[PDB]
Amino acid sequence: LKKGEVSLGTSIMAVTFKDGVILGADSRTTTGAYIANRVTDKLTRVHDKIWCCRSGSAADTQAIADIVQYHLELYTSQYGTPSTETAASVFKELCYENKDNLTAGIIVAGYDDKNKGEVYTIPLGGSVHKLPYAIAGSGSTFIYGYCDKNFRENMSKEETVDFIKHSLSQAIKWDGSSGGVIRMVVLTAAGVERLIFYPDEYEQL
Amino acid sequence: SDPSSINGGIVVAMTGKDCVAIACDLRLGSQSLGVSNKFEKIFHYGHVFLGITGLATDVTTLNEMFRYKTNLYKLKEERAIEPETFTQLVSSSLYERRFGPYFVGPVVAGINSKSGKPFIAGFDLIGCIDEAKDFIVSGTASDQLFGMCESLYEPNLEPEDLFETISQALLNAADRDALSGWGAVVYIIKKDEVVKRYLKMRQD
Amino acid sequence: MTDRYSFSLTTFSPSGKLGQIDYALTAVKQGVTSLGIKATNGVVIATEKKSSSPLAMSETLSKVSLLTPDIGAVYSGMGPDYRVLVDKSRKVAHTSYKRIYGEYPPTKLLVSEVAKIMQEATQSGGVRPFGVSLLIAGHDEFNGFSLYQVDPSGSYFPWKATAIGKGSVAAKTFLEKRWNDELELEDAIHIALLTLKESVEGEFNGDTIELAIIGDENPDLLGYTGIPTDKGPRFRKLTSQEINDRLEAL
Amino acid sequence: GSRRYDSRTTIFSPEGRLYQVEYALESISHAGTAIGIMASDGIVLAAERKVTSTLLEQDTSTEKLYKLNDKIAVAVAGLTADAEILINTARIHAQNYLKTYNEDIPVEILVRRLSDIKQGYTQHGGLRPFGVSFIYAGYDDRYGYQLYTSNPSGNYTGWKAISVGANTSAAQTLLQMDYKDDMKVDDAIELALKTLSKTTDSSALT
Amino acid sequence: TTIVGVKFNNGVVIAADTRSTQGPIVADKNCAKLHRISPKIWCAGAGTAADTEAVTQLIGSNIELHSLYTSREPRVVSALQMLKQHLFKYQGHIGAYLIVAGVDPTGSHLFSIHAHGSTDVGYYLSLGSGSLAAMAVLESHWKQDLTKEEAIKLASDAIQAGIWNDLGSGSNVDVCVMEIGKDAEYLRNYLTPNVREEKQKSYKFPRGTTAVLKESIVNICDI
Amino acid sequence: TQQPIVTGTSVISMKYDNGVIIAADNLGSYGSLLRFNGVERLIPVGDNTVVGISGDISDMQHIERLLKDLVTENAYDNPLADAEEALEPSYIFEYLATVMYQRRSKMNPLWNAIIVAGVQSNGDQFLRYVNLLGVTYSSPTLATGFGAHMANPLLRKVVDRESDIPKTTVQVAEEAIVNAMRVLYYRDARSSRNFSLAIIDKNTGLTFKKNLQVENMKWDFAKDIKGYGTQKI
Amino acid sequence: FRNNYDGDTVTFSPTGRLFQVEYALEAIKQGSVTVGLRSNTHAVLVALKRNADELSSYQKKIIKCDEHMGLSLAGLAPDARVLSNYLRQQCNYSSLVFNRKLAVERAGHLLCDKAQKNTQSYGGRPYGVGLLIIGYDKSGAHLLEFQPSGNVTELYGTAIGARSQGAKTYLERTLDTFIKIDGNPDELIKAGVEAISQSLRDESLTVDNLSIAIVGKDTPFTIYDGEAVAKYI
Amino acid sequence: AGYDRHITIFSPEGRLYQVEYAFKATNQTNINSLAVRGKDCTVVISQKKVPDKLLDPTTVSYIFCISRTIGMVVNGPIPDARNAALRAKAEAAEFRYKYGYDMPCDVLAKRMANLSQIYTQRAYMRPLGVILTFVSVDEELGPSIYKTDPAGYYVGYKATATGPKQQEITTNLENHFKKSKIDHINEESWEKVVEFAITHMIDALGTEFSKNDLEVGVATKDKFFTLSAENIEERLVAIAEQD
Amino acid sequence: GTGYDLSNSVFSPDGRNFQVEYAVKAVENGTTSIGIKCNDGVVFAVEKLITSKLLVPQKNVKIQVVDRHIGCVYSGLIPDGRHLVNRGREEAASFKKLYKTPIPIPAFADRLGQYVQAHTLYNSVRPFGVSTIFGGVDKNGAHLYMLEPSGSYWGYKGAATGKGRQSAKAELEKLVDHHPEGLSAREAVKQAAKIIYLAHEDNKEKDFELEISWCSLSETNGLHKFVKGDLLQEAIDFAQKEING
């Protein structure tokens, strides 16, 4: 990769519901076995209505998202507001063009008011794929069964926060490269709500 | 073959009171076979003395770069370079040649001739700046040389007494080597007279 | 398909004169008053800040720029030419004397880079000279205090006092008389303010006056009171309030 | 149009001269006088500082006298600004001979590199030529002292005494009489000064 | 080395130890690990000596160039981003582990940077060979309602933990207090707590055992 | 130099006397995790050619954009008659294969193996092969990947020479295609349950059946269980 | 005045066109006369070649650009070579990249861009030579008129060269007749000879002078030169 | 050389013909503009004239949103206005990524200035005649109003106006400012600032405006928005009932 | 003369250089194009002049596509018009790859806009002698834009350029106002044909062929097609009932 072992929470998802999309991740950077950071941002803004969840290697992802932030700042300004799918293309370009040196697993998650929330998953190699919900990181595999039954098209805002709160807290419990606070980002027409739940809270609920 | 230890060489610098001293061997070898009893690894541009040990091809190319840099700077400013300024000039030139494959250990020596300080400063393979003024050593036997300087050296010495120190310190470290025989020189510098004393020492 | 042009915009004339340079000598004359006095004990530079709408402000304009911390510069001629030149000059000073060195540039040496830039733009077509003449005032430890003048051609000369801008000869003549030998930096400020008063009329305020000295470097000008690690500014602008005190004191 | 801004003033004339070159020869006569005396014991260089205010300083006497190398120096008749561009390139020219062969540059070569460069600008590039003459004072152990001069056309010649600047002709006429095969430096110092006093376009001499 | 950074509700403290080693033998009791970027953006650096210092001067230059250009204060976030883009191009070839700190009009900030290319924002951060022992002190004794005296006192304790348990660390401790309200204080050699490797004494050399093959004099000259 | 991190498997195809049929499951693998199902492998180009891609999904998205450019530029400078001078199988084939051949020759490879199928509106049947290795060939039956191994011997029994071609009508050919896929779903799990099936008819043009799933299921094997991996203590 | 608007190519005049375009247009006419006619199955070009002298001999000005593509010039020989080289590269690429025989419409538009581009400089210039570009692809035979201004029109018959109008009026008459002579090489050749003679009014019609060129339904690009036109006179 | 009527150089009078004529036509869009600062906000009010009824008004703008917080008013001909907008928006976006920080009014100003001065020397390239008014509500200095002119000149303002009725607006502003002795309006809420601005405009150009005749853009903390037709109408209405 | 008749390298007191003035003229000597915005679409129409019997219908059409949903039609000089769309096509294609989206109509307008502005600040690069009317349907709605030699563009409800530009706009503003916008895409084709007819009086010395096209959301379903066959004949017929000039 870039240089050495940099690693993150490795459990992210974006989920669709009645009002938009809620994206969730756990936040924790480790560099080997030393805890480089308790609480970080893996819920990264690339546009005001378009955020991402970052997975893969922390450095790689951060360079790539920087570049994304730059292209959409310019796209917005010249060509108008971009889609989730458009954000997703810039990510894909980078991932594909630098698969031979960087590893970036991106879930691009966005809320639009005229097509609702959309979830796009970007492979390590760089690809653009549409789903009604996605789970990525490598602890996503153990909650695949859970997510697939208890996801439903149309749910309340409180309820979606429970589904994402339950999903990730299981992932963090079995997984060993995960920990620290749980962050969420709710992109709705009620604004951008940033949710934080502290260790004691998600464990219990 | 070896990266810098083909021809060997070791260099010692010391601080005193209105004097410094800088000393070197005269070995040039071709592997462990000593070839020559002359090879001067210390050069000077005016009142700044630069010793660089290591591989000879690399000491020569650098020596000509610093001569160039200093000459043209001297010409523009209408005065010589200062020990302090030259240490800056060295860091950057070396950081340009870190990416290139040089194998050098420079050490910078002089006395400031209008600020009135003895000045010595050090440089490495990586080319990092070392601010200390007591002794700085470099070369093959740098490990033996620090052990020796750190016990033998005592702070603030007159030129005669700095000579007795530097000479013996070098001579005994050198005697545990074969890569540091083939004669040696010592230079005792004040900024208005320089004494050169050749030592008589071991070879293979 | 373009960028094939390199024929000069500065040519010889039949008096062997240079066309652009004659034109530019006027531009300097149509400027406003700026002066320099070297007291030996420092350097003082002062100018009139003036502005081109009543709704504009000249308190939020600047005509002295820091080139490097310890050196400040002022001009007479055209505003646009001055801004691009200062930027290019600030660039070369950082790159070539703090990445190759670490000591801030000696003054004269900085003058030679500004001069080289201006002459370069005169040689080469598709650019034209800068239409400005500078007094670059600095301090360096191995020179002492210094004052240089750069002419619009790219030519330089040292002066221990000089004046530029409207009524150039007459301002300079006034300095020769009022100041002889070596006098103080403080005293030279008192003089500089008077000299600047006589050139101008209809503005007399300290919000239209900018006077700066190179003459001290304090921890207060260092931005930290710890143990020094760099020289820091020797440039200091005197306050609008500070200027106002001294006008009363003439 | 690009060529409809071009005037082609860089070309040979109907008289076969180069407009811009001839104009540069003129420039040199309106700048100060420079005199070079070579003796076999030294070289005496003077250059005349015109427009001297009292608020011009007298602590500088390096601003038309430039060391190009530590055995070569010049006196400039021309501008500070023209000279400076060439001066830096000369100094560099010095370091190249020095680094490669580990000895001092010959004068005769170093002069040629400047002249070829001047020549270059008026042939190609669409450029102005530099309006500057140099009198070169330098030493070799293959030739003793050498003294050259180069001028705006790219032509350069050797002289054993030379004048350039205002009133060249008059200075030279005086020089030709007072010259003698026998030399010393201190004798040459007297010679330079006697002449200098009589070429000034201002009364007496200071 | 042991480099630390600690936030208080009025400013930021960084501190470092100043020991450069070649083996266990102490080459330098003093070399700065605390580098000044601008009067109030100070940066601590760890790892390979040559790399941290050079990078810090390139950035140091580009930021000062910036400050004059905008006729406004330099931001800490500019220095941060320059550092990241420089590491990224060179893909890790720069081996700088940095702790970048600064005070601006935006408030007091504390970030750290790995050579690996990841940045983090922390309430307290540490890096170095003394990184484990120091980060331990800092997380435990950091508290809400931190102040200047408490932040210096904590900072002393940190460097000291790293000295004691990493014995490649030792020598003087230099501290730098950067306050938003008052002019920053660089405290050179605030503590002088450990000394030089072992000596046995040494004494004068007799001149019947030190001999000279031949000698001359020479003189320094400049034209 | 590329290391596959994703696969798509299986495109099988054959000619019949009056057209060609091609079918392919829809698949985005990440090895053995069937990460994506909704990755189309059959990209219809016009209405008389289908481009079938197996291999790496990462190369496949890049090509997916080039195949869409190919349509676009063929309406550029040709406004009309776009089925006599545009969107012909031989062109689609040739376009793709030049980019493929150049990418593999400079060591940055397009890691796919592709079948271009059609009925030419200027000709008769088209079935032509291209791979990452640069080799190209035509045969009455062509299949890529795991189907190249397994399906194609079944298909060769239907047509393998000009003589065998009159002996395959619409009905028999479509039955072969349906049979083959089911074999693929059964003996390789990488293949998705979900498929697309396309018939490109010399009279009817392109008729494309979407969102099909394999049927007439094998479950017979469950009868004959004795264990094959079961342990007893 | 005149010298303003001739001496620059990155100008325009009050009329809505630069003077250099008027001179380039004049230059096509300064060529020797050539007609082109098609019925849209075959396309023929019949050309009167003049040579300078009795001691000169004829050199080619009908150019095979492919074995299905060609051109005739009228105007400036130097320029004509430059254009012909371009069309030839263009024909080659079309075959290698797309398997195409190149339509005239696509070729014209590309020749246009280069021409445009050289009025977007000083020291580039319009060609000042016109071409009748023929070829037989899958939408049939085609005849284009290219002008060095960039005006591309497809005409069913046309002429360029001095006294274009003579053949052109003959062509507008015989139109309806020739377009319903479909599928005949020999009827159309005979027509071409008849046509070129309505141009003539100060020049002779002789075997060695005349030159015929064909491409068509069952004819790849074949030229009749010299002797071999006698039997169509 | 020998040319100055085909290429751009210094005049011996010293007033450069190309710069002077660029000062003159800008007014070819039938615009008049001002920007003022309130205590907390910066409001721009700008004219719009619609010359056909084959034209929509809502695609007609002279305010371009550079970033999220920065506004720019261009007074000029619209092909030149837009050319500058495209360049400014990318340089702003480039700065924001590199330096982690949103572009200052003055820095944008300065950078476009230095470039126009470069094009002024250039003998193969012309300068844009655009007059660019950069506004925002910075939190590192408050409200700011900084105006460039095509020359390369820029200077800080208290409020500014552009168009031929520059003098008339100037006087209206000078009178208010002398009276309060402040360089800003201190009215809490943006609203009261927009209305005041509107009054002074109606006085200067001496006509009542309509919803479709003004276009109003207001800059607020950390966000910039243009105001709509329906809202613009609320402003005109409310001042009719002060007398 | 003023020297700005052959330079783009300097500023003129007309606000614009004479050589840009000369390109505008060339637009006015081409043959009429219009654009009709609708409540579900856009309609393009063009006059092509027939002089000779040798021409073939709809292959010498001056209507060119970009992508598959963007319609471009122009009046004035032929080589300049082709060059222009050819640049637009490259930049569009670049957009399509990079952002994996079809181009917006306001985005395409800029993309052309900067290229057209660039050759008026350069002396060495020739202005366009075409005015191009373009638009389509996109994911923001339908949009009609028209681009001038200046680099001037604005959003329209109806637009015209070519010889009959004045006459045509006069009839058009009346109809566009009397309706909401020219009703639906079907209605508009008959009206369009009537404009092409009236416009031919400004050109009545040579004959015409009416050539119409559309890209309409609700009556072509997001694609650009030429309007032809039964419908094109029908529209000429409708025109010849009412106008009988």
Swiss-Prot record, chain F:
InterPro entries: Ntn_hydrolases_N, Proteasome_beta4, Proteasome_bsu_CS, Proteasome_sua/b, Proteasome_suB-type
GO biological process: proteasomal ubiquitin-independent protein catabolic process; proteasome assembly; proteasome-mediated ubiquitin-dependent protein catabolic process
Keyword presence, Nucleus: yes
Gene3D superfamilies, A to Z: Glutamine Phosphoribosylpyrophosphate, subunit 1, domain 1 (3.60.20.10)
Record GO cellular component, one term: nucleus
Entry-linked Pfam families: Proteasome
Alphabetical keyword list: Cytoplasm, Nucleus, Proteasome
The keyword Ligase is annotated on this UniProt entry: no
Annotated compartments: Cytoplasm; Nucleus
Function, in words: Non-catalytic component of the proteasome which degrades poly-ubiquitinated proteins in the cytoplasm and in the nucleus. It is essential for the regulated turnover of proteins and for the removal of misfolded proteins. The proteasome is a multicatalytic proteinase complex that is characterized by its ability to cleave peptides with Arg, Phe, Tyr, Leu, and Glu adjacent to the leaving group at neutral or slightly basic pH. It has an ATP-dependent proteolytic activity. PRE3 and PRE4 are necessary for the peptidyl-glutamyl-peptide-hydrolyzing activity.
Other information: Present with 16900 molecules/cell in log phase SD medium.
Family classification: Belongs to the peptidase T1B family.
PANTHER family, alphabetized: METALLOPROTEASE TLDD, PROTEASOME SUBUNIT BETA
UniProt name for this protein: Proteasome subunit beta type-7
Swiss-Prot record, chain G:
Entry annotated with the keyword Cytoplasm: yes
Subcellular location: Cytoplasm; Nucleus
Superkingdom of origin organism: Eukaryota
GO biological process: proteasomal ubiquitin-independent protein catabolic process; proteasome-mediated ubiquitin-dependent protein catabolic process
Database matches in InterPro entries: Ntn_hydrolases_N, Proteasome_alpha, Proteasome_alpha-type, Proteasome_asu_N, Proteasome_sua/b
The entry's keywords: Cytoplasm, Isopeptide bond, Nucleus, Phosphoprotein, Proteasome, Ubl conjugation
Entry similarity comment: Belongs to the peptidase T1A family.
Record's protein name: Proteasome subunit alpha type-6
Protein source organism: Saccharomyces cerevisiae (strain ATCC 204508 / S288c)
Taxonomy of the source species: Eukaryota, Fungi, Dikarya, Ascomycota, Saccharomycotina
Gene: PRE5
From Swiss-Prot, chain H:
Organism expressing this protein natively: Saccharomyces cerevisiae (strain ATCC 204508 / S288c)
Top-level taxonomy: Eukaryota, Fungi, Dikarya, Ascomycota, Saccharomycotina
Short name of one Pfam family: Proteasome
GO biological process: proteasomal ubiquitin-independent protein catabolic process; proteasome-mediated ubiquitin-dependent protein catabolic process
InterPro entries from the UniProt entry: Ntn_hydrolases_N, Proteasome_alpha, Proteasome_alpha-type, Proteasome_asu_N, Proteasome_sua/b, Proteasome_subunit_alpha6
Gene3D superfamilies linked to this entry: Glutamine Phosphoribosylpyrophosphate, subunit 1, domain 1
Keyword list, A-Z: Acetylation, Cytoplasm, Isopeptide bond, Nucleus, Phosphoprotein, Proteasome, Ubl conjugation
Protein name: Proteasome subunit alpha type-1
SUPFAM superfamilies xref list: N-terminal nucleophile aminohydrolases (Ntn hydrolases)
Swiss-Prot record, chain I:
Assembly and oligomerization: The 26S proteasome consists of a 20S proteasome core and two 19S regulatory subunits. The 20S proteasome core is composed of 28 subunits that are arranged in four stacked rings, resulting in a barrel-shaped structure. The two end rings are each formed by seven alpha subunits, and the two central rings are each formed by seven beta subunits. The catalytic chamber with the active sites is on the inside of the barrel.
Pfam families: Proteasome, Proteasome_A_N
Superkingdom field: Eukaryota
UniProt keyword terms in alphabetical order: Acetylation, Cytoplasm, Nucleus, Proteasome
Localization: Cytoplasm; Nucleus
UniProt similarity note: Belongs to the peptidase T1A family.
Post-translational modification: The alpha and beta forms are probably products of the same gene with different post-translational modifications.
Biological role stated in the UniProt entry: The proteasome degrades poly-ubiquitinated proteins in the cytoplasm and in the nucleus. It is essential for the regulated turnover of proteins and for the removal of misfolded proteins. The proteasome is a multicatalytic proteinase complex that is characterized by its ability to cleave peptides with Arg, Phe, Tyr, Leu, and Glu adjacent to the leaving group at neutral or slightly basic pH. It has an ATP-dependent proteolytic activity.
Organism: Saccharomyces cerevisiae (strain ATCC 204508 / S288c) (Baker's yeast)
Principal subcellular localization: cytoplasm
Further comment: Present with 12000 molecules/cell in log phase SD medium.
Molecular function (Gene Ontology), one example: mRNA binding
